[model samples]
Target: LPARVGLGITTVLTLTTQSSGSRASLPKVSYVKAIDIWLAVCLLFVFSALLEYAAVNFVSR
Candidate 1:
């Protein structure tokens, strides 16, 4: 499930990058900011952690 989330996020980001400029052209380097990548990774980890926490709590109960 976490992997699927990551894949979905990746697909969305890729589509966003592609659509924000001329057709068939790669997004500019400036468009791909470091913070954007960092935030995406951080969010993915946070999501996974929360999911694990929820599962553990559910199992314990």
Candidate 2:
């Protein structure tokens, strides 16, 4: 009985410590350029405009 209890406690503590240690690491971010940001914004605006046009002209008809 004592041996079984000790094994269970050790297993739980090992898993808990492993998870806590892994969660402490931070994610890395990729570098961005000015042109890339501008291009992304431009594409977003163009897509929005196209969607609005389609909704107004095609769906309304």
Candidate 3:
């Protein structure tokens, strides 16, 4: 019961100070995206396959 009460208090306080950028549960401005990193990794994998195919003098026979 005490934990619940404490959580209620914290929630109230978090809302009360929400405009001041007090988001302990979620820091909105303290994050980033990752699409580019994955893009680079995938492109490198494709390049590796192409290099391997070229290593055999461009012939599977």
Candidate 4:
């Protein structure tokens, strides 16, 4: 009961403050794309496989 009442009061206060004050803007940021990182990791594994194959063929003797 107390938690619900506290939540309701907090929400009301937040809305009241937003209506009465200025809003702040966040800074711009750049991030690596998830898809690109996964693709690069996959290509690296492929290269590693090829190098392993070449090593076994040439250096096995």
Candidate 5:
């Protein structure tokens, strides 16, 4: 999942870099400043956690 998230981020970054301008240098994006990437990772984790927890809670019945 982390790997997939990373790939998705790279895709977005590549798009952003291309859309912004075609320069010799590409901008460096870290997780802290990149909201799109952070949101993608965070939300996936949150939802997956909830899903696992729900499955465990329901399995007893």
Candidate 6:
């Protein structure tokens, strides 16, 4: 998870170094940011799945 997050950030940084044009760079940056956003949402779902499973089991018991 962190690895994927870092991968997204690193790719964005790579663009900065490779593009060196913030004005034109935004398109790629925005795409990378979207990747990060989706990754975070995935992480949240995973954590919640585990957490909610435990909570539900406890309550049912």
Q: Report the CA-based lDDT of candidate 4 relative to the real structure.
A: 0.53
Ranking according to lDDT, highest score first? 6, 1, 5, 2, 4, 3
RMSD (CA, Å), candidate 3 to true, equals 18.6
Clashes of each: 0, 0, 0, 0, 0, 0
Model 1: per-residue lDDT, tens digit, 1-61? 9899789877766744453433555367634553365456556757887998998888875
Clashing pairs in 1: none
Candidate 5 lDDT, 1-61, residue by residue in tens: 9899879867755755554433634355543345455455556756877988898898855
Residue 3 lDDT (model 4):
98
After TM-score superposition, what is the CA distance of residue 46 in candidate 5 from its true location, in Å? Answer: 0.9
Superposed on all Cα atoms, the candidates' RMSDs to the truth, in angstroms, are 7.4, 19.6, 18.6, 20.3, 8.7, 9.1
Local distance difference test scores for all models: 0.62, 0.54, 0.51, 0.53, 0.60, 0.63
Off by over 4 Å in 1: 1-32
Residue-by-residue lDDT tens digits, candidate 3, 2-60:
89977875664454444233343435442222233333444565687688879767676
Give me the candidate number with maximum lDDT.
6
| Model 5 ranges with Cα > 4 A deviation | 1-33
Q: Each model's TM-score, in the order given?
A: 0.39, 0.37, 0.34, 0.39, 0.39, 0.38
Candidate 6 lDDT, tens digit per residue, 1-61? 8799778866755654444433545577665675555446556656876998899988875
lDDT of 6: 0.63
Candidate 2 wrong stretches, greater than 4 Å: 1-32, 58-61
Q: What TM-score would candidate 5 get against the native?
A: 0.39
Clash list (residue pairs), candidate 6: none
